[PDB]
Amino acid sequence: NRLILAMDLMNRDDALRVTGEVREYIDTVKIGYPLVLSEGMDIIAEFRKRFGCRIIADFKVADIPETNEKICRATFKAGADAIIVHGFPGADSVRACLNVAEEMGREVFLLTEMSHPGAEMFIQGAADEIARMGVDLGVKNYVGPSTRPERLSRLREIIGQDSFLISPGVGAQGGDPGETLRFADAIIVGRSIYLADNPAAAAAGIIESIKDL
Amino acid sequence: NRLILAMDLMNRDDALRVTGEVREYIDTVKIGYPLVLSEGMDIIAEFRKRFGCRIIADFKVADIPETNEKICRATFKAGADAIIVHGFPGADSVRACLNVAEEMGREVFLLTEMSHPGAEMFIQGAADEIARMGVDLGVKNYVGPSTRPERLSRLREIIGQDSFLISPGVGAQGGDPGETLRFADAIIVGRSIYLADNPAAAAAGIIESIKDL
Numbered sequence A, B: 001n002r003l004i005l006a007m008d009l010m011n012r013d014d015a016l017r018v019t020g021e022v023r024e025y026i027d028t029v030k031i032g033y034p035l036v037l038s039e040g041m042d043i044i045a046e047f048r049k050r051f052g053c054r055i056i057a058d059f060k061v062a063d064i065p066e067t068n069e070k071i072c073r074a075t076f077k078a079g080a081d082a083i084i085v086h087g088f089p090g091a092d093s094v095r096a097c098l099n100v101a102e103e104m105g106r107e108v109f110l111l112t113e114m115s116h117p118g119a120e121m122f123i124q125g126a127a128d129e130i131a132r133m134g135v136d137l138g139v140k141n142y143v144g145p146s147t148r149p150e151r152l153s154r155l156r157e158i159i160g161q162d163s164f165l166i167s168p169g170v171g172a173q174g175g176d177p178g179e180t181l182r183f184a185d186a187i188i189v190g191r192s193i194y195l196a197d198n199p200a201a202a203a204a205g206i207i208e209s210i211k212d213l
């Protein structure tokens, strides 16, 4: 695959239909707050049972250590395989997530630099240090921006070749599968697939581009 | 009051009992992901209907603009009066939240500097600029740390006297109601109340200290 579906539809019926339509082209579904806050955490269990795919909970966890632990424990209890957590709040907040993931046999992904224009204001300047903090904490899974492949390159340099790196911002945000997969292990794609007239054809089209690399 | 309850219990029965016990000492309940991810967004509507108090959704929103809008729209649809959003992701992410709050007749609180030790690593260095970004965006409600009253002072200086400023980190995290209320309009208190043998007595004790100021 190398393709992770960002399932940000907000209606259970549509989320299930689109995921079902594209599942032959992905092995991982990324579920975030647009779907969870609309349909409840039980949606994570349903997706697991219906589809079998890995579930990453994209909750961009960004609270104090005590609250981060509670968020992680609720999320894994609901059946998520991994959770995405922000590095910007610092090492104690990240460690809290890693401690729960250890307890529960799950994975943490560290979000380093974000893909949107606003990320340039504060996040970008800290992002190398956030990545290096990850390495120092023993984080093995990272998120970095498809929209800035030169920053992906730098992040890959920091985390090394033996870390797993996934990357949002492909399609709608302007990122390209090829420029991104030079550095990331897998791309995250939401709207380019789930808003397409034929999501299966969109996913298939992306997979064809990936195979050509 | 000047007291906001951080309701981070993870069981509907306990959350309702403790809130009911202390409601005569607060007019605002802050509900976050520990309770919502455990009991569902319907908990917000229940609290509103049972208690009448203002509800602030402490979701520390930290995504891209398009996703931030979806998160805000789901949260207000569930009945929250206000949402807490991170400033660190930048102005476009914040504006997205403000646009939804405008559409829906609700409020955004901008989180500037966080209260925990890790906030020193990256957030603190950006926090003055995040506050000034808030002012430039017309944000009128802010969150800053009880644990660092000198930073609260600086944040108050930036936002001015006509902005509303609320402050977590009182009690469990080491913050003091008095040192904090020199600068903040209201303090947020969670564990010092909700883990107390008698939460009503804990809240009452805090209110007594506040009245003495």
Ligand SMILES: *c1c(F)c(=O)[nH]c(=O)n1[C@@H]1O[C@H](COP(=O)(O)O)[C@@H](O)[C@H]1O
Pocket: A006, A008, A032, A058, A060, A111, A113, A114, A115, A116, A145, A168, A169, A170, A171, A172, A173, A188, A189, A190, A191, A192, B063, B064, B067
């Ligand atoms: C999260 C994040 F931290 C980013 O830096 N960028 C980003 O886009 N996200 C989330 O990833 C998905 C992108 O979907 P698409 O732009 O393909 O529709 C979304 O879930 C977004 O929240």
Ligand SMILES: *c1c(F)c(=O)[nH]c(=O)n1[C@@H]1O[C@H](COP(=O)(O)O)[C@@H](O)[C@H]1O
Pocket: A063, A064, A067, B006, B008, B032, B058, B060, B111, B113, B114, B115, B116, B145, B168, B169, B170, B171, B172, B173, B188, B189, B190, B191, B192
């Ligand atoms: C959020 C935040 F952004 C902070 O800087 N600090 C902080 O503590 N929070 C949240 O506020 C409440 C504090 O509760 P207490 O320490 O009194 O138990 C919690 O909801 C925490 O997530």
